[PDB]
Amino acid sequence: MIIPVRCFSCGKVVGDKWDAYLRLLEEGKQEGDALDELKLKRYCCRRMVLTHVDLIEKFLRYNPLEK
């Protein structure tokens, strides 16, 4: 739904690296190189950013219920 704050397995904070990851991918870097540049060594952390699906961008497209 939205990038988790901590890696499930170990507990490293990965919630502050989603925007940087997208910026790096925008510049043409490969996914492995982008994850390496963010200093994500353990594959337990790498799966958190690699396999995250961002669904909040789909929930936000609905008109807000209040105003």
- Give the pair of three-digit tokens for residue 14: 């990965």
Return the number of other C-beta atoms located less than 10 Å from residue 35's C-beta.
22
Between 2 and 10, CB nearer to Zn ion: 10
Residues touching Zn ion, count (CB under 5 A)? 6
In the window 27-66, what residues touch other proteins (CB under 8 A)? 28, 30-31, 50, 53-54, 57, 60-66
Q: Which does 9 bind (CB under 5 to 8 A by kind): Zn ion, other proteins, none?
A: Zn ion
Contacts of 45 (CB under 8 A, 6+ apart): 7, 9, 10, 12, 14
Between 28 and 62, CB nearer to Zn ion: 62
